[PDB]
């Protein structure tokens, strides 16, 4: 198409925003995964492979 | 020119620029004869 690229820019900025937020959630779940791993003593959980 | 002022204002008034945005979005997606000369206010009467 050839329409106005306002969608492109707004999707890019909102995409980057959600990357930042989601990554923060991945740090959160990363500390969760690590303390579960430490508590159990086995590598990165027991339900899924590493 | 309204863009800088809109940046200074924030977001709680965004819609006030709505139609302005519209007349910008058009600009990216897109003799005369006299009036009010007042000779109508003139008057002619013969009975005088």
Automatic annotation (TrEMBL), chain A:
It comes from the Bacteria. The chain crosses the membrane at residues 11-31. This is DotA. It comes from Legionella pneumophila subsp. pneumophila (strain Philadelphia 1 / ATCC 33152 / DSM 7513). The gene is dotA.
From TrEMBL, chain B:
This is DotA. It comes from the Bacteria. The lineage of its organism: Bacteria, Pseudomonadati, Pseudomonadota, Gammaproteobacteria, Legionellales. It comes from Legionella pneumophila subsp. pneumophila (strain Philadelphia 1 / ATCC 33152 / DSM 7513).
């Amino acid at each position: 198409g050839t329409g106005s690229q306002i969608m492109g820019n707004m999707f890019g900025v909102f995409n980057s925003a959600v990357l930042a937020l989601g990554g923060i959630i991945i740090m959160y779940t990363l500390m969760v995964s690590t303390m579960n791993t430490a508590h159990e003593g086995q590598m990165l959980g027991q339900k899924w492979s590493s | 020119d309204f863009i800088a002022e809109a940046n200074a204002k924030g977001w709680i008034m965004a819609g006030s620029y709505f139609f302005d945005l519209v007349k910008l979005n058009g600009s990216a997606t897109e003799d005369q004869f006299d009036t009010g000369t007042g000779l109508d206010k003139s008057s002619f009467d013969p009975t005088q």
